[PDB]
Amino acid sequence: HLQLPRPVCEAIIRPVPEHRADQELSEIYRDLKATFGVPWVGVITQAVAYYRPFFAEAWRRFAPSAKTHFFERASDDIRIRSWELMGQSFVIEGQTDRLREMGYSVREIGQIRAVLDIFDYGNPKYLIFATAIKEGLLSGRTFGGAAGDARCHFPRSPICQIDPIPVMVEEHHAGGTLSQVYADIKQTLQLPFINSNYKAMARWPSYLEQAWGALKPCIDTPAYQAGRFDINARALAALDALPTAYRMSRDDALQAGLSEAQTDELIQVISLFQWMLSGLVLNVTHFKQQAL
Amino acid sequence: HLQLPRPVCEAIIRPVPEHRADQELSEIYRDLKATFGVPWVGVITQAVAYYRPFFAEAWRRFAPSAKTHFFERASDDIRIRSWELMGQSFVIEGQTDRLREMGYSVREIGQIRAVLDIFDYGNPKYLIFATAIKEGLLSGRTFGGAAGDARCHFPRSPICQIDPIPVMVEEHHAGGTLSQVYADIKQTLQLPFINSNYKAMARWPSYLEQAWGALKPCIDTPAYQAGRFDINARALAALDALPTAYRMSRDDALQAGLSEAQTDELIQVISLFQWMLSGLVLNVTHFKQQAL
Amino acid sequence: HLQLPRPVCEAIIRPVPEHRADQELSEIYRDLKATFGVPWVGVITQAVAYYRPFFAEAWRRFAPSAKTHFFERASDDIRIRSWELMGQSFVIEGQTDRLREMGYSVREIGQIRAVLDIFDYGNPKYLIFATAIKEGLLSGRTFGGAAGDARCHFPRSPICQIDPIPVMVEEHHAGGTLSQVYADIKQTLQLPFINSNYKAMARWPSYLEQAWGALKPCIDTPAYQAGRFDINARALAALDALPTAYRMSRDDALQAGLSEAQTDELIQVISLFQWMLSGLVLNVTHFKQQAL
Amino acid sequence: HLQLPRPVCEAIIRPVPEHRADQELSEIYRDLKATFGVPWVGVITQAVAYYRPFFAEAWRRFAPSAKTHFFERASDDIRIRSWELMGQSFVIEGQTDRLREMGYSVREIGQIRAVLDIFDYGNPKYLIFATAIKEGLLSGRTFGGAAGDARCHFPRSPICQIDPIPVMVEEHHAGGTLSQVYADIKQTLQLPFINSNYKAMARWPSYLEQAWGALKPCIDTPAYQAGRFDINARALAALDALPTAYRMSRDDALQAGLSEAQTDELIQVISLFQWMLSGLVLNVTHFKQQAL
């Protein structure tokens, strides 16, 4: 029974979306995107940003790591691993023919694949970031900083995609049946928010119903839970070998400008996100293999 | 009391969307967009593109006029007239603050308006093109060609937006309720298809429901039908004063490579579109006034 | 013999370029651009931006008029006039074959024409705004605000291009022969700066060389000076017909935060730029006819 | 004292630039760019494009390996080795402060770095592809195909940057002093063409003058030559570990539609480009290190 505990939490999640961010926050958002090389600010980071003084500081200490060849490779290796697991554990029926007969052209299918690629690339990076924040607060420990192989400190593979923000059908954008599909995803993944990935997929509603329909039965199966732990374990491994040292303890959260009551709540918010993210990575992988 | 008769169309409408155009047709589509200065190909042009030898020739004869200062003013002046007519004939509520209550941020509402602007600007150009194609086929007459005021033949005000294609939720992207909204629109406006602007509005499903709900009771009221007649009449006036002579008769269709059967079918397709376009212009004006 | 006298100016101009504008200034810059519907901030407004609280206030007072149908038309009508004058007065030979033989492709020439259209469209708007700044300071008068045709107050032709900033070879970017062409232009036009449109033409050095060389002999011919006078006069006539009253006096400048010595300086700077802009409008027109 | 011998090239090179490629060739270019995930078509592939049925055939046989985790990783590792080599062998002074003295602002220098990143990322992909074309022709051999690590056959790190084409100051665009800077590079690098990256730096002529001036003394020092050999041998090694077998021999060229003499010509051409590419990787690495 390889594990992964869904956390003790329903402390309020107050994510600040990019279309509401003031220009101080937007500046940190821009730098995050620019550093990760992704066109979206993840919901994990939106929710941590509510604790803005901790967020700016947490990010300041993690950024030097995130700019490294190490971090690109360790993120990439989680993408590879997710691909490996989901192929071996599940028989994933291709969906292209069904989509074509639903009216979807080859170009449109191409656009759908391109959107999936953004999250297949990005999410591991948010997973590793989520893990440093959680483990740093909970444990007090200083992670990484070894000189080791000097190539691990080199600049990461350079070229991004930062504009535009992907088209996402926010919860308040949603129509009748779309709200039903979001509620389903919410209950099935046991979450109080809808991830960016499904929101971007929901630009093509019928495609999302079909894609989510295929994935849903696989959720929380024994192979699923086991892959989730493997992915969770590798994220913890990347954190243990950050090329630039990273510390951000409860006491660091105080000095950043947070109360102890605020730090506590943050801990429960990040635990939810960190747990969730390993699952989200397997989900996008499945979607991406559907679209083979 | 006046009004525009819906034509008797039983013919089959086969739009070729931009995401299915082959490379030959896509060239024509790009020339059309660049000429008009709009980021999208109209459903009118997509359906006429099915009759491709005719579409390519009719466009070659019409494009010289479309490039003129006259055609920009003539189009602009139909947008102004629609604004005027909908302002006088209709009490129209500002909906911006009801969208705020629904969750819509200031940036999001700005994006919505930007989208309305594209069609408010472009639709008259298509109405005039459609009118030319229809009257040319029915009358066999040569329209325009007067030297007149030399300034009418100058290049049009040159800035434009031609990429990206507006984000449109197509009928096969539609989930449950969005099909219901699309059905409601087709039935209420007497159309076998959904125009581009509604599809673009559909990226925000909840906004569309709201904006369509507020327009719907105005449809085919006396004042609507009177304004619609007036809009139509100006399209016909614009056709009469094209700077470059336009002729495209049933015979010209034959020599372009169409049969007489296909030409007859084309005459009803464009009649349906041309009628429709006067209504669409008022519809977008209403939306745009709602977003005030 | 109509000649537009060049104002005395030995004040120092200090443009704040877009790539150096801080957050605050950049926000004003973006509102400017979105209102004019241009992808670039003019040097005129860059220079005036140095006197920041004046720039901020003057723009707030001018923007309500710039958003209107009237302003779109009055700007556009100066373009038409420039086109008219330059065609009437000069035999302007095409340069397209010369460019083709120089190795320029049809796509490249397309690109060059697009760049020219940007400034053909936008400079009249900057010309009118310069005139309003200059005359409001000099005269203390309140301009416009009359009742008039209600359609003048309608929103302007909506579609815009706000991004990206055109590629411009700044003066610290330039090489040797580009520094010389830049210097010949500064000499001939009697200016201490290179205008945006010359810097954008400059992305193709060998093209600017040719285009500039052909325009140069026309500068300060009698027909050119006469046409420029006419162009200036129409900017003056627009100022009086502004739909929303504009007042920004010597005393408003003081109440905004400026010193007497600053306000004097601003007056010399805005008058050098106001004079310059009628010339620029003609120059772009000549380039654009060259490239037909 | 390792050196990479320069081949003899009697043959005329004939690049088909992206702005002249017809519809057919553009389609291949686009797939090339989509597969490599770079926004530009290398001069190498432009030159081979002249022998079109060969290029189309060599590409279709290479693209299966170019889409793989292996190719991404092998290309990335050549960038890393270049950074490593130049780091150890040279004391490379920052130049950001000199640029900032010349007038360049922080945003601007950011834009320069982004342009350098494109070529840092992309050239190793063109280098390996050039080596496969060369060695295929020279040796008749079949390269790669070994099953090996199954992970090697997974899709590469997904995310792309396909638009827009870098702003490049082509040779027919250049001024007098750029021509001579362009001649200097041709002479010093022993080439009859100007590579894409230098053409992109030339957008900032004063910066290219500076950055090239700083690289020139390092060219053909023993550490450079030695480093260049090493880069070369790593490209040969990548060739043997290709995940999909690649064969494109002299006979295959003949079957494709090339004549004997053309095949002779192609061989010299590809040989010169293959040789150039290892040095070009060093050069870009050096520029990028100057600008850190």
From Swiss-Prot, chains A, B, C, D:
Homotetramer. Belongs to the HAD-like hydrolase superfamily. S-2-haloalkanoic acid dehalogenase family. It is an enzyme of class 3 (hydrolase). Its EC number is 3.8.1.9. This is (R)-2-haloacid dehalogenase. It catalyses: an (R)-2-haloacid + H2O = a (2S)-2-hydroxycarboxylate + a halide anion + H(+). GO terms for molecular function: (R)-2-haloacid dehalogenase activity. The keyword Hydrolase applies. The gene is hadD. Keywords: Hydrolase. Catalyzes the hydrolytic dehalogenation of small (R)-2-haloalkanoic acids to yield the corresponding (S)-2-hydroxyalkanoic acids. Disulfide bonds: none annotated. InterPro entries: 2-haloacid_dehalogenase_DehI (IPR019714), AhpD-like (IPR029032).
